[PDB]
Short mmCIF file of all heavy atoms in Angstrom, two decimals:
data_model
loop_
_atom_site.label_atom_id
_atom_site.label_comp_id
_atom_site.label_asym_id
_atom_site.label_seq_id
_atom_site.Cartn_x
_atom_site.Cartn_y
_atom_site.Cartn_z
N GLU A 2935 41.20 33.57 23.14
CA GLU A 2935 41.68 34.95 23.22
C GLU A 2935 40.93 35.74 24.30
O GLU A 2935 41.54 36.44 25.13
CB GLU A 2935 41.58 35.62 21.86
CG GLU A 2935 42.74 35.23 20.96
CD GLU A 2935 42.48 35.52 19.50
OE1 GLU A 2935 41.66 36.41 19.20
OE2 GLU A 2935 43.09 34.84 18.65
N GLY A 2945 43.69 40.21 37.12
CA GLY A 2945 44.72 40.89 37.90
C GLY A 2945 44.70 42.39 37.72
O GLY A 2945 45.11 43.13 38.62
N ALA A 2996 28.30 16.60 10.15
CA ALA A 2996 29.43 17.07 10.93
C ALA A 2996 30.29 15.85 11.22
O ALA A 2996 29.77 14.79 11.59
CB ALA A 2996 28.97 17.73 12.22
N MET A 3003 35.49 19.54 18.10
CA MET A 3003 35.65 20.96 18.38
C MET A 3003 34.37 21.57 18.94
O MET A 3003 34.44 22.52 19.72
CB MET A 3003 36.08 21.75 17.15
CG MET A 3003 35.31 21.47 15.90
SD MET A 3003 36.18 22.20 14.51
CE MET A 3003 37.22 20.82 14.10
N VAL A 3013 34.33 27.09 30.93
CA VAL A 3013 35.44 27.66 31.69
C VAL A 3013 35.30 29.18 31.76
O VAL A 3013 35.52 29.79 32.81
CB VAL A 3013 36.79 27.24 31.08
CG1 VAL A 3013 37.93 27.86 31.87
CG2 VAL A 3013 36.91 25.73 31.08
N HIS A 3017 31.96 31.46 37.32
CA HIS A 3017 32.05 32.49 38.37
C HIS A 3017 32.28 33.88 37.79
O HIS A 3017 33.06 34.67 38.34
CB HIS A 3017 33.14 32.16 39.39
CG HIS A 3017 33.18 30.72 39.80
ND1 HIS A 3017 33.69 29.73 39.00
CD2 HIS A 3017 32.77 30.11 40.94
CE1 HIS A 3017 33.60 28.57 39.62
NE2 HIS A 3017 33.04 28.77 40.80
N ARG A 3043 27.93 10.40 22.25
CA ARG A 3043 28.26 9.15 21.56
C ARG A 3043 29.65 9.21 20.94
O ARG A 3043 30.56 8.48 21.37
CB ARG A 3043 27.26 8.85 20.44
CG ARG A 3043 25.79 8.75 20.81
CD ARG A 3043 25.50 7.37 21.41
NE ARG A 3043 25.85 7.27 22.82
CZ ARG A 3043 24.97 7.39 23.80
NH1 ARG A 3043 23.68 7.56 23.56
NH2 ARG A 3043 25.39 7.32 25.06
N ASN A 3074 28.52 26.10 51.97
CA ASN A 3074 28.59 27.51 52.35
C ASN A 3074 27.22 28.05 52.74
O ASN A 3074 27.13 28.90 53.62
CB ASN A 3074 29.26 28.36 51.26
CG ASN A 3074 28.41 28.55 50.01
OD1 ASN A 3074 27.23 28.23 49.98
ND2 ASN A 3074 29.03 29.09 48.97
N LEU A 3102 21.94 25.76 37.54
CA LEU A 3102 20.67 25.05 37.47
C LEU A 3102 20.09 25.01 36.05
O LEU A 3102 19.81 23.90 35.56
CB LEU A 3102 19.66 25.65 38.46
CG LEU A 3102 19.75 25.32 39.95
CD1 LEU A 3102 20.94 25.99 40.60
CD2 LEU A 3102 18.46 25.72 40.66
N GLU A 3124 32.87 6.14 33.47
CA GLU A 3124 34.15 6.06 34.17
C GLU A 3124 34.38 7.34 34.96
O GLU A 3124 34.82 8.35 34.41
CB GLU A 3124 35.30 5.82 33.18
CG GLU A 3124 35.22 4.46 32.50
CD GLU A 3124 35.40 3.31 33.47
OE1 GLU A 3124 36.15 3.49 34.46
OE2 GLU A 3124 34.80 2.24 33.25
N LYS A 3144 15.79 23.67 54.26
CA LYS A 3144 14.66 24.56 54.45
C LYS A 3144 15.19 25.95 54.81
O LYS A 3144 15.69 26.16 55.91
CB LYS A 3144 13.72 24.04 55.54
CG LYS A 3144 12.57 24.98 55.89
CD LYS A 3144 11.71 25.34 54.68
CE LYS A 3144 11.16 24.09 53.99
NZ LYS A 3144 10.02 24.42 53.10
N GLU A 3157 13.05 20.61 38.52
CA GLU A 3157 13.21 20.30 37.10
C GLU A 3157 14.64 19.86 36.79
O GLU A 3157 14.85 18.92 36.01
CB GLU A 3157 12.80 21.51 36.26
CG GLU A 3157 12.73 21.24 34.76
CD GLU A 3157 14.02 21.58 34.05
OE1 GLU A 3157 14.71 22.52 34.49
OE2 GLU A 3157 14.35 20.90 33.05
N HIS A 3178 22.82 -6.01 39.82
CA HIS A 3178 22.35 -6.67 38.62
C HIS A 3178 22.65 -5.86 37.36
O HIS A 3178 22.47 -6.37 36.25
CB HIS A 3178 20.85 -6.97 38.70
CG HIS A 3178 20.40 -7.57 40.00
ND1 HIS A 3178 21.06 -7.38 41.20
CD2 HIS A 3178 19.35 -8.38 40.28
CE1 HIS A 3178 20.44 -8.04 42.16
NE2 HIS A 3178 19.39 -8.65 41.63
N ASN A 3207 21.49 9.96 52.47
CA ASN A 3207 20.28 10.69 52.81
C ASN A 3207 19.20 10.57 51.74
O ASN A 3207 18.05 10.93 52.00
CB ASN A 3207 20.61 12.16 53.10
CG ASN A 3207 21.25 12.87 51.92
OD1 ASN A 3207 21.40 12.29 50.84
ND2 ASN A 3207 21.62 14.13 52.12
N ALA A 3222 -0.68 10.95 50.64
CA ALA A 3222 -1.91 10.94 49.85
C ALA A 3222 -3.14 10.78 50.74
O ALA A 3222 -4.13 11.50 50.56
CB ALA A 3222 -1.86 9.84 48.80
N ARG A 3227 -1.51 20.63 53.94
CA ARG A 3227 -1.49 21.84 53.13
C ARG A 3227 -0.09 22.09 52.58
O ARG A 3227 0.92 21.61 53.12
CB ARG A 3227 -1.95 23.04 53.96
CG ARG A 3227 -3.34 22.90 54.59
CD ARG A 3227 -4.48 23.06 53.59
NE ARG A 3227 -4.59 21.95 52.64
CZ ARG A 3227 -5.01 20.74 52.96
NH1 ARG A 3227 -5.39 20.43 54.19
NH2 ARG A 3227 -5.06 19.80 52.02
N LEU A 3242 10.23 11.08 41.05
CA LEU A 3242 9.73 9.74 40.77
C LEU A 3242 9.17 9.65 39.35
O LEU A 3242 9.28 8.61 38.70
CB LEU A 3242 8.67 9.36 41.80
CG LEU A 3242 9.28 8.76 43.07
CD1 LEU A 3242 8.78 9.49 44.29
CD2 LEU A 3242 9.01 7.28 43.18
N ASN A 3256 9.16 -5.19 29.91
CA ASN A 3256 9.70 -5.12 28.55
C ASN A 3256 10.47 -6.38 28.19
O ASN A 3256 10.55 -6.74 27.01
CB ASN A 3256 10.59 -3.90 28.39
CG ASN A 3256 9.83 -2.60 28.50
OD1 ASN A 3256 9.41 -2.20 29.58
ND2 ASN A 3256 9.66 -1.93 27.37
N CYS A 3264 17.06 -8.60 37.01
CA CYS A 3264 16.95 -7.25 36.47
C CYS A 3264 17.24 -6.21 37.54
O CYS A 3264 17.68 -6.53 38.65
CB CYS A 3264 15.56 -7.04 35.88
SG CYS A 3264 15.20 -5.33 35.46
N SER A 3270 3.35 -3.11 36.65
CA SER A 3270 2.22 -2.35 36.12
C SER A 3270 1.34 -1.83 37.24
O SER A 3270 0.83 -0.70 37.17
CB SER A 3270 1.41 -3.20 35.14
OG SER A 3270 0.48 -2.41 34.43
N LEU A 3288 -6.15 20.29 45.16
CA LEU A 3288 -6.45 21.08 43.98
C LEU A 3288 -6.91 22.49 44.35
O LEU A 3288 -6.42 23.48 43.82
CB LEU A 3288 -7.52 20.38 43.14
CG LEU A 3288 -7.79 20.82 41.70
CD1 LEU A 3288 -6.51 20.77 40.91
CD2 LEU A 3288 -8.85 19.97 41.04
N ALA A 3294 1.16 27.33 39.87
CA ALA A 3294 1.80 26.81 38.67
C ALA A 3294 2.55 25.52 38.94
O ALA A 3294 2.84 24.75 38.00
CB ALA A 3294 2.75 27.85 38.08
N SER A 3303 3.91 14.56 34.96
CA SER A 3303 3.13 13.33 34.89
C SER A 3303 2.78 12.95 33.46
O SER A 3303 2.36 11.81 33.22
CB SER A 3303 1.84 13.47 35.71
OG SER A 3303 0.87 14.21 35.00
N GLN A 3313 -8.49 3.91 28.69
CA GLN A 3313 -9.70 3.14 28.99
C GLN A 3313 -9.66 2.53 30.39
O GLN A 3313 -10.66 2.57 31.10
CB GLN A 3313 -9.89 2.05 27.93
CG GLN A 3313 -9.61 2.52 26.52
CD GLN A 3313 -10.47 3.71 26.12
OE1 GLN A 3313 -11.69 3.67 26.24
NE2 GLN A 3313 -9.83 4.77 25.64
N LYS A 3316 -10.30 5.05 33.31
CA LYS A 3316 -11.66 5.28 33.78
C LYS A 3316 -11.96 4.44 35.02
O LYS A 3316 -11.21 3.53 35.38
CB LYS A 3316 -12.66 4.97 32.67
CG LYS A 3316 -12.44 5.75 31.39
CD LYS A 3316 -12.55 7.25 31.63
CE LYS A 3316 -12.56 8.02 30.32
NZ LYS A 3316 -11.23 7.99 29.65
#
Side-chain angles (χ1 to χ4, degrees):
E2935 280 163 24
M3003 48 192 89
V3013 179
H3017 317 76
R3043 303 280 81 99
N3074 71 11
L3102 282 72
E3124 294 295 328
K3144 175 57 56 163
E3157 189 267 327
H3178 314 26
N3207 60 3
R3227 304 285 70 72
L3242 275 127
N3256 294 73
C3264 169
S3270 191
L3288 194 56
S3303 78
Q3313 318 302 308
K3316 303 299 189 290

